[PDB]
Structures are given as C-alpha cells and as structure tokens.
Design a binder for these strands. Structure first.
Length: 92
DNA sequence: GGATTACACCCAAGACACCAGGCACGAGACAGCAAAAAACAACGAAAACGGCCAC
C-alpha cells in the first residue's frame, strides 16, 4: 500500500490491524462501524496518523443518528472523559 | 334408776360428674364405554473476530 501508486483503497477491520503496521501512505480515513473499546480507534487513526506523517490526515466517522450508534458514541465520549479527568483534572 | 332429753352413728336416697360410645360431621379419596385414527400447538437458540499453537 505504501510503495505502490495504485492500490488506492483497502479495508482493514481494525481489530487484527493496528499491532504496529506501518501504513503511512494513507491520508484519508473512513470509520464505518463504532467499536466497543475506545482504544481500538486510536490505533485505527494511527494507521494513517503515524508520528510525523507526510501529509495531513482526516477522519470521517459514520454514525446512524437515532440508533445504538448514538448510545455507543456517547458512551465512548464518556469513556474519553473518564481517562480525560482522572489523568487531567479530577474536578470535571 | 331409767327414761325422757339429747346427740352420735350411719345408711339410704340423693346428686354431680364421669366414662364411653354413639352420631353426626367432615373432609379425604375417589372415580367414573372400550376399541380404533387423525388432525393438532406446544413442549423448544451463545455473536463474532483475533492471536495464537498444532495441523
């Protein structure tokens, strides 16, 4: 994927992929389905947002409004707050 | 002294309670064609993917 001008897109199923695979070639990212682990998505974004990435990277989240996606996304935001007030400011 | 005067002794009619057995209740305990056959609803779910080791 990195060393070929063709082979533009490829699906990854971000459970198996994210162990540290180097995919700096990517610049755009599409998230299709929200996951349960709030962590599995940071490695997913890091599949194109490696340290010192060559070009700007963007994330497009898919979210079905008025569905379980709403509950999961709010849950993930709450989980981010959990690790973002325990380690940032316990007054939040 | 001995019999009227009185009082003790007991015994017979009496009663209440006793002893049991009836009598009614009281609720269990039933207990209710056989043979043949067919329809006929209900008895009734661990997802899915990865990182492996051993093929």
């Amino acid at each position: 994927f990195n060393n070929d001008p063709s082979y533009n897109v490829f699906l990854l199923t971000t459970r198996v992929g994210g162990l540290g695979v180097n995919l700096t070639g990517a610049n755009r990212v599409i998230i299709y389905d929200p996951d349960w682990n709030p962590s599995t998505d940071v490695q997913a974004r890091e599949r194109a947002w490696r340290l010192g990435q060559k070009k700007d990277v963007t994330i497009y989240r898919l979210m079905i409004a008025g569905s379980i996606e709403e509950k999961i996304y709010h849950r993930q935001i709450f989980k981010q707050f959990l690790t973002n007030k325990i380690l940032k400011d316990p007054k939040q």
